[PDB]
Amino acid sequence: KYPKQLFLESKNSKMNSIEMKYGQDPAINRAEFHVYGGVRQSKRKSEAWEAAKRITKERGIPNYNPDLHLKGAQMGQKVLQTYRITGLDREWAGGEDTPAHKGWKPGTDIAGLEMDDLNYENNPAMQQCYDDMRRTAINGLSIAHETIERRFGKEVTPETINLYFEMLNHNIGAGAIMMEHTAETNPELVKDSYAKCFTGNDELADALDQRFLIDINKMFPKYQADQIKAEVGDRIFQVARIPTMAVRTSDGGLSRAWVGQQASLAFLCAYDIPAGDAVTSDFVFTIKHGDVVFMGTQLPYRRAQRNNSAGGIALGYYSDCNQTSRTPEALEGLDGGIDPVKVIVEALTPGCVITDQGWLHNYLAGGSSGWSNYIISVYTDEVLEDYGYHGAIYAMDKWKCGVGEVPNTYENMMTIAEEVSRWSQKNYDEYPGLMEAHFGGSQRYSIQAAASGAAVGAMTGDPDLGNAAWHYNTPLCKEHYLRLGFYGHDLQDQQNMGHTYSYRSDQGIPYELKGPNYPDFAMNVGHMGGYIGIIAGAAHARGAAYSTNPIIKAAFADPNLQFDFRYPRREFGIGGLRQFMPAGERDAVIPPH
Amino acid sequence: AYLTEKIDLYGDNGKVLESDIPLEAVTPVQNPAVRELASIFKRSVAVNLGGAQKALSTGHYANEYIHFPDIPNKDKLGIKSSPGGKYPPKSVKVRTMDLPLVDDADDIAARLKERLQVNPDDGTEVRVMKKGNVLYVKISEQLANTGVEYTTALTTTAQAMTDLVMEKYDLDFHASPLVHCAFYGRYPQTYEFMGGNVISLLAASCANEGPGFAMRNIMANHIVAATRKRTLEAVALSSTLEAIGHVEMGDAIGRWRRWQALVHACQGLNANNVVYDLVKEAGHGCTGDVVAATVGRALEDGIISVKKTLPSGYKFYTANDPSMWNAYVCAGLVAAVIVNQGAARAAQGVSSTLLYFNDLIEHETGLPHAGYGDGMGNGVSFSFFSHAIYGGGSPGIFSGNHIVTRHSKGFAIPVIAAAVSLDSGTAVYGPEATSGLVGDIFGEVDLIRRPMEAIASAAAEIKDKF
Amino acid sequence: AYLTEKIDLYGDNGKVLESDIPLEAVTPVQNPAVRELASIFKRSVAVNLGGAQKALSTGHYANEYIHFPDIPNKDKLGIKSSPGGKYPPKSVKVRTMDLPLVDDADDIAARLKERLQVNPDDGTEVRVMKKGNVLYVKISEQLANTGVEYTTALTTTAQAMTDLVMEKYDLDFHASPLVHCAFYGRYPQTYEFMGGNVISLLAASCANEGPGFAMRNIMANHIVAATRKRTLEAVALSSTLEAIGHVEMGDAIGRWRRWQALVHACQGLNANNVVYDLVKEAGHGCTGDVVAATVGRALEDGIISVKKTLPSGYKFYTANDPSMWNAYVCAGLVAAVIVNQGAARAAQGVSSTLLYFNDLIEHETGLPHAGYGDGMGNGVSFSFFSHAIYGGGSPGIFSGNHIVTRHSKGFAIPVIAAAVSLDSGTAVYGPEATSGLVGDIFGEVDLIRRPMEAIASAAAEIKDKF
Amino acid sequence: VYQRQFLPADDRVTKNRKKVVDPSVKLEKIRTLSDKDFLTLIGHRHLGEAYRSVNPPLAEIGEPEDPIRELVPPTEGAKAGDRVCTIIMTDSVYNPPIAHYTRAWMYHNRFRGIDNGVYSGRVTLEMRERDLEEACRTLFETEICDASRDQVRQYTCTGHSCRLDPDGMMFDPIERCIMSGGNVVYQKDSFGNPVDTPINMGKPLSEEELIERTVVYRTDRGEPMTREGDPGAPDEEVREALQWSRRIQWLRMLGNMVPDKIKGM
Numbered sequence A: 001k002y003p004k005q006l007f008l009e010s011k012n013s014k015m016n017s018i019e020m021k022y023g024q025d026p027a028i029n030r031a032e033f034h035v036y037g038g039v040r041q042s043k044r045k046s047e048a049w050e051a052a053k054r055i056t057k058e059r060g061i062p063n064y065n066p067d068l069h070l071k072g073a074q075m076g077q078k079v080l081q082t083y084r085i086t087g088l089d090r091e092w093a094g095g096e097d098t099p100a101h102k103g104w105k106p107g108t109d110i111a112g113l114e115m116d117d118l119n120y121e122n123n124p125a126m127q128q129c130y131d132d133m134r135r136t137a138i139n140g141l142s143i144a145h146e147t148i149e150r151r152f153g154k155e156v157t158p159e160t161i162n163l164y165f166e167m168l169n170h171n172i173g174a175g176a177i178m179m180e181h182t183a184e185t186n187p188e189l190v191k192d193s194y195a196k197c198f199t200g201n202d203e204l205a206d207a208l209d210q211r212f213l214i215d216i217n218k219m220f221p222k223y224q225a226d227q228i229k230a231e232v233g234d235r236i237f238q239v240a241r242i243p244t245m246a247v248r249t250s251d252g253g254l255s256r257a258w259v260g261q262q263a264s265l266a267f268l269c270a271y272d273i274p275a276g277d278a279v280t281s282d283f284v285f286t287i288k289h290g291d292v293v294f295m296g297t298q299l300p301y302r303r304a305q306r307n308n309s310a311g312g313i314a315l316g317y318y319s320d321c322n323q324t325s326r327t328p329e330a331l332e333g334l335d336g337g338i339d340p341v342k343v344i345v346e347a348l349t350p351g352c353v354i355t356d357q358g359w360l361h362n363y364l365a366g367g368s369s370g371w372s373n374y375i376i377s378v379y380t381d382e383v384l385e386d387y388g389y390h391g392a393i394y395a396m397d398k399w400k401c402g403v404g405e406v407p408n409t410y411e412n413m414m415t416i417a418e419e420v421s422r423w424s425q426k427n428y429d430e431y432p433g434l435m436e437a438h439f440g441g442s443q444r445y446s447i448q449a450a451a452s453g454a455a456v457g458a459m460t461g462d463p464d465l466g467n468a469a470w471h472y473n474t475p476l477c478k479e480h481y482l483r484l485g486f487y488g489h490d491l492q493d494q495q496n497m498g499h500t501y502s503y504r505s506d507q508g509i510p511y512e513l514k515g516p517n518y519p520d521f522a523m524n525v526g527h528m529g530g531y532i533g534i535i536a537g538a539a540h541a542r543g544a545a546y547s548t549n550p551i552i553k554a555a556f557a558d559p560n561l562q563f564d565f566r567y568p569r570r571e572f573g574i575g576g577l578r579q580f581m582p583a584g585e586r587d588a589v590i591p592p593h
Numbered sequence B, C: 001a002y003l004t005e006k007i008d009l010y011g012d013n014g015k016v017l018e019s020d021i022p023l024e025a026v027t028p029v030q031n032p033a034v035r036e037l038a039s040i041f042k043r044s045v046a047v048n049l050g051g052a053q054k055a056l057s058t059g060h061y062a063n064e065y066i067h068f069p070d071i072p073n074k075d076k077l078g079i080k081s082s083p084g085g086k087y088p089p090k091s092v093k094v095r096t097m098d099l100p101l102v103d104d105a106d107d108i109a110a111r112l113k114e115r116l117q118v119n120p121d122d123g124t125e126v127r128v129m130k131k132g133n134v135l136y137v138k139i140s141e142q143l144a145n146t147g148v149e150y151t152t153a154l155t156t157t158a159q160a161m162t163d164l165v166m167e168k169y170d171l172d173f174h175a176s177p178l179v180h181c182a183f184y185g186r187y188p189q190t191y192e193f194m195g196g197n198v199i200s201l202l203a204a205s206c207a208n209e210g211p212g213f214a215m216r217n218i219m220a221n222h223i224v225a226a227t228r229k230r231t232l233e234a235v236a237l238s239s240t241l242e243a244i245g246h247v248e249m250g251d252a253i254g255r256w257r258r259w260q261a262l263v264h265a266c267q268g269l270n271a272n273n274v275v276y277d278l279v280k281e282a283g284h285g286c287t288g289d290v291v292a293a294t295v296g297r298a299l300e301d302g303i304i305s306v307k308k309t310l311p312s313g314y315k316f317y318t319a320n321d322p323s324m325w326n327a328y329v330c331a332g333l334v335a336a337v338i339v340n341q342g343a344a345r346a347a348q349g350v351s352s353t354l355l356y357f358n359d360l361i362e363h364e365t366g367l368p369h370a371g372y373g374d375g376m377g378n379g380v381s382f383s384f385f386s387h388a389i390y391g392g393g394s395p396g397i398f399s400g401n402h403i404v405t406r407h408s409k410g411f412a413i414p415v416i417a418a419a420v421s422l423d424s425g426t427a428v429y430g431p432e433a434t435s436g437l438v439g440d441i442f443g444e445v446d447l448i449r450r451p452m453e454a455i456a457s458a459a460a461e462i463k464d465k466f
Numbered sequence D: 001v002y003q004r005q006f007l008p009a010d011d012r013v014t015k016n017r018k019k020v021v022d023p024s025v026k027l028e029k030i031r032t033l034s035d036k037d038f039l040t041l042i043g044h045r046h047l048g049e050a051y052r053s054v055n056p057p058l059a060e061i062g063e064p065e066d067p068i069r070e071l072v073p074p075t076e077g078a079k080a081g082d083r084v085c086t087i088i089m090t091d092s093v094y095n096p097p098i099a100h101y102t103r104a105w106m107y108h109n110r111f112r113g114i115d116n117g118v119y120s121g122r123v124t125l126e127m128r129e130r131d132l133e134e135a136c137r138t139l140f141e142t143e144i145c146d147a148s149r150d151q152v153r154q155y156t157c158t159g160h161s162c163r164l165d166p167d168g169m170m171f172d173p174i175e176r177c178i179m180s181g182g183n184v185v186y187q188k189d190s191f192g193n194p195v196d197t198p199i200n201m202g203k204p205l206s207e208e209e210l211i212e213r214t215v216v217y218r219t220d221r222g223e224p225m226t227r228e229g230d231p232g233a234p235d236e237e238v239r240e241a242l243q244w245s246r247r248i249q250w251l252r253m254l255g256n257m258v259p260d261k262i263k264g265m
């Protein structure tokens, strides 16, 4: 009772993602090797070799040289495959121009990308996704307004708030207000930096200058707006984004400090407070410490970080910054019903790329590869997509219910995991071209685990139980193939078969609040983004507007963001096409180049 | 060698508590009350049962406005959760639960005490407070001194609470992470038990500025809350915590030990009634009247003398006892804050008094101020970072571990404690805002709330040893 | 309640040390020798007088190839230092000095002791070692317990050394920073006394992975050096440090306390001779022979029984005592490393044995391995990070606080200690390279070098209390 | 001494696993390699070359008095102080007679004094040099080495999951193996270096012969670990490997919740 696999036939464009890699039926266990010209089969690597020759001549030191590959064998003795972004043919919304690119035509595929196009090092959409997270500072303003009204003695009104925000938008990136003879920043360098606010009080929202407003009523469907507004209440939260260029000179911990300076100044200047009045220190303290929401928490000494590093971001904060939950595709994509699978598979895309390439690679390890093929596998060619939907189809038929409604018993988790594992293995076993595409055991193992957890999370609404299904895939995978992933893959899988429902000191913690500093997760690729997706989808499936923090969810519902948090697979593909214009470049102040 | 010189210890009413006390007997390395103070900070925590219960019930776990949502009205949302609407939406409840922790506080307290106790006679204490909303916990010395760390009360209490709740209510596997979160907050994703419900007076053990700083990482607001704004008790608590901290930093050693001990005795314990006498003489005046009183008292007691008269008639003074001169400046510094910030009943000028009492002293005498530069230096840094855009905050959020105020060797935070004690409610981030639970719970401990007489009585018990 | 079940404690020669010991009596919360081990780690430091003397003399201060250069031959450099060469170049000496610290070690030790001692007969000790090149220092409990931190021996010793050297040689003002650097290294620019000459067995107090981890931040190489490679004593030291650490982490509580205590007793203290018996039975074979011996011993002792026979004849076993089964797997795990890495006399395969002993156990029995996932998980992580480009290192640099190896609840690091003890010199980052001074100096402390008999004797002294 | 059962063996695939890992079962020799060819293939030392050392002979290093160490006799390589050397093999996903976790289990049951890593694409074995040579006779010459599906390769190891070449041979980027006159022959050593004469491994097995001896489950041939009617079905209706997998998951979950919860289960 199962449909044709999505990796052989995309739902609308009917592309065969696996066949396209080879021009041969992927069911056939036969291939010729050593006949591709090595790297000459790759446009990017061939172009890179030519560029490298020019670079060597200019700088006097050799660089990229494919002929160094070991023992006379250039890379490319097998097909160096291209990739198709999963699911783009099933989108119908999100066609607006963004700060990074003109409007995408929803439904348009991105196929034929090379591996190097989806390397974090080469892909500005991926870098900008992280930069947008870490340059964000979020604060309640209630205490600052209280200090002004009682200590200083001046009334706060919508008019004074509007002036405050106009001044903060002048000074957050570019300008000065109070002082003579003060240096300023070139506006071209900081055009991505701005500040807005949101509130659950609709009368206040309507009284504010809409240019400074994240409009919850406009951004979210009514049931989600209702839930978010109920949590925000009659309060005002500020969302400020410091310059991308600035975090690229330093760290995300700059954000709360920077906004502390500039918001304090905007208060002084909008309310005419004397320079050096004692109230000033309440503003910076409020912004840095007193009423503050961070994307990430600090990390301990071995991996020391201030706030707003990727390693400090809780899984559920990665879940909730993603905005797929408010898209038409997520709200009506299952024949008019909500589609938590779409939420899962989108949210896991920045989840995986940022935690594994942005953080584990570009902070904790590194090098020229970005570990890119490992992670490309989770958002391309409809493979994980097919397996995840398979579990949902199976479960909806078996339990005769909708998403989020299968009883969240351990037995039901194990049944769904057994079927999704089975289906994953059936396809890798029956399609030699797919087994060769996902040539690393880690890709295949993470994919069956992720699909299982996606199905359980979407079908039960329970994020811990969905992630329990991930770890149960360990024996199901190992006892079938007699191989798993790379040498160090199954640290967390083995131990979380036990830790998921432990309460020992550093073992127990809800999945929403786990993150890259949970010790089991602190080292290895191929996992955290899956959990992130599962958390997001579990909440979506049970009728919630967010999983972990309504302030985070609202704070990223903002069309002025450089990265489109609603459609991350698409965005990464656009970066793969070299069509994503990031923020933070220094063109305004450097020579013609 | 022992610090045998005798001092008298006076209470905050200006009357003697104990006479003829060798300086040695108030030092942290000797005095049993000072040492018990450190021990109680190490061994005491509070369990917020009301907070844990609310987090589990509503899904508002941890901090930062976190909310794990359970949706009880899924069929009223205007959504279809089945393709084509085949099946109507059914709500689930998967992140929250109602446990009667506060109602059951007495039985919970008994179970907690049994899990923490090592042996029946070991002194473990668990007290039910706030109608069952809070437990005060003091672990035994036996447990606390097992290893090398000061965090054992925190860690054992969090695990014991988690285990005993899981057991008492016979909770299912789903509850393990959620009950853990109710007590531990975001641990171990955070090093801190961030947003949890087990609270220590001490900061997380990742947070020191250097080795030995733990007893310094205690906000002035905590000290003022715990002493309920009784000025010289706040001074004594702060000064004693600083004194313990400076032993642990290694600075109460060798040719610096007497200097460091005298800061504590003279500024923190009203030795020889100097602080009280200076406030009494100058209290109807200004900072400068305290300057006059301090120099006069130093002259009267033989601590300083005229060294040279310049042709204009200006006189350089010499310190006949440099460490005692420093300590007299430290005593005058707290008196000056009491007079100046006391007159205004407003704490903010404490930073200005710290700077200009010391500056005026040097211009008046030709002798170096407290800490040979640190008193003025911290007057500068603390003033700046309590009146500018860059960082800092109001006076009460500073501590001996705060980067702005750490430098002075033990004589700066006590004047902040004095000023905040005298404040009439001019702050937003006052003790009520940052330290209310700390003051309500830990302020019930007599030694924390009223250290002066305890330290003096303990010194009298050991005085004949030196 | 007390852990009253009786065990026998055997030495590493397979002969009984003490019989009829209640499990309670070996736990860190009760056993005086275990508690004294923590206390000695907290209170002992070494002063490298030879290193301090050399740094001052040559200008090679601190670490990282730092060198503050003094140039004694300025007129031979081919430079002019005056316009037009009007005045010939003259050398100066401004960053270095020659002090006879090693030759004066005995007097220095006396001056140091006097600065550290709080009261006569308080237990402060300073011992001259290595013909004057090193002092062993143990501060008194009186000093160490003044505040809340474990760093007081480190901080007081560094300051006392600096003060006493400045005084003894009556050095000028220029010397203050340099003598400070000779002892403290880069402190306070670094939190550590980085590149200094005062050494603790414990890491800097900024470096924990979480609260309670200090006794876990001790490399296997340090443990092996201190026990001079006597395999089961290294195992006992590591296991006991882990046991203390797990108390301080809060994990030796409530329904987990017995499980945690049995890991220590069975894996770390050769309880009931299990470890020795397994090695004796299987030592001429392979890892799998230890698997057979472990399952056989669990059956013999009634810990497990056949639960179900599947149609193929394969038998699932059930744990009649789950915590004891876990502890027997932990004992088998250390025996397996001893047999496998012992046969090779090469430590590197320890990570593979950790993984596959546990994997074989599960396939053999249908019961969960050590730590319900952690034994295999750390087998995976430790194997990866000792054979890959990404991080890590050779076995001896790991510890209970290392991110790669922290997860297992107390039963992983002791097997590293066993493997490194058995290694014939196959490493370049062996105990001699990372831990030579530690082994030479702290290995002289009998309790550190030879904990098994001390723990057993102390348990026998208190056995009648439970 | 207790008699091991090793793992559940309810079918041909799992009985093949049990045979590989059970040290009492002799692995049949299926090819002969000259000493020169054998050492050339390994690539660490050639015939007649002295063993290199990493440390002095064990009797010269001053081992401490240590009663436990006494119980464990050193291997010959340990006595000599040989360097610890690595050999790497890769088993195709397509019906190999041994696969990667079975290598680890076999090594730990059959060979003394080992280090060993399992990866999806290769398996390392690291032993004192002379000890490694003895182990490699089993790895290269017995029924656990089909020349086309179990190959020796020290790096650039991709191929386990690649499609088979037109002759049924697993891919090797470096081309250390080639099919020549129906025989598999190493034309380069395990390091990809030149060899004076190719090393003949003889004929590969046919696909039906590989399937009879394989340790892997494969869905395409009709033998998945999990059959279509197995998810959620009672234990008695599923393969013993799945019964075992379910048990391990239940007991890890419950035992790590509270250990006593698994008493008698």
Ligand SMILES: C[C@@H](OP(=O)(O)O)[C@H](NC(=O)CCCCCCS)C(=O)O
Residues within 6 Å of the ligand: A257, A288, B385, B390, B391, B392, B393, B403, B404
């Ligand atoms: C004071 C302190 O800030 P907080 O009071 O902790 O918010 C500290 N900042 C600084 O020191 C800001 C220094 C730069 C601004 C002043 C330039 S004169 C910091 O970030 O830790």
Ligand SMILES: C[C@@H](OP(=O)(O)O)[C@H](NC(=O)CCCCCCS)C(=O)O
Residues within 6 Å of the ligand: A302, A303, A360, A361, A364, A365, A488, A522, A523, A524, A525, C385, C390, C391, C392, C393, C403, C404
């Ligand atoms: C292990 C540890 O490194 P060290 O052993 O301390 O050098 C740690 N790195 C990592 O965890 C690297 C993680 C990314 C590489 C592995 C990806 S699977 C760190 O930087 O603290």
Ligand SMILES: C[C@H](O)CO[C@@H](C)CO[C@@H](C)CO
Residues within 6 Å of the ligand: D246, D247, D250, D251, D265
């Ligand atoms: C390991 C054992 O087979 C697990 O049994 C479960 C399938 C059922 O047990 C639960 C429902 C009660 O402990």
Ligand SMILES: O=S(=O)(O)CCS
Residues within 6 Å of the ligand: A486, A487, A488, C384, C387, C388, C389, D119
């Ligand atoms: O070969 S290892 O598994 O160690 C590293 C894979 S990227």
Ligand SMILES: [Cl-]
Residues within 6 Å of the ligand: B191, B192, B193, B194, B203, B204
């Ligand atoms: Cl904390």
Ligand SMILES: [Cl-]
Residues within 6 Å of the ligand: B255, B258, B259, B323
């Ligand atoms: Cl003095």
Ligand SMILES: [Cl-]
Residues within 6 Å of the ligand: C191, C192, C193, C194, C203, C204
């Ligand atoms: Cl240090």
Ligand SMILES: [Cl-]
Residues within 6 Å of the ligand: C255, C258, C259, C323, D259, D260
């Ligand atoms: Cl138990």
Ligand SMILES: [Cl-]
Residues within 6 Å of the ligand: D046, D047, D048, D049
């Ligand atoms: Cl030979």
Ligand SMILES: [K+]
Residues within 6 Å of the ligand: A210, A211, A212, A213, A214, A215
């Ligand atoms: K707007």
Ligand SMILES: [Mn+2]
Residues within 6 Å of the ligand: A585, A587, A593
């Ligand atoms: Mn440009």
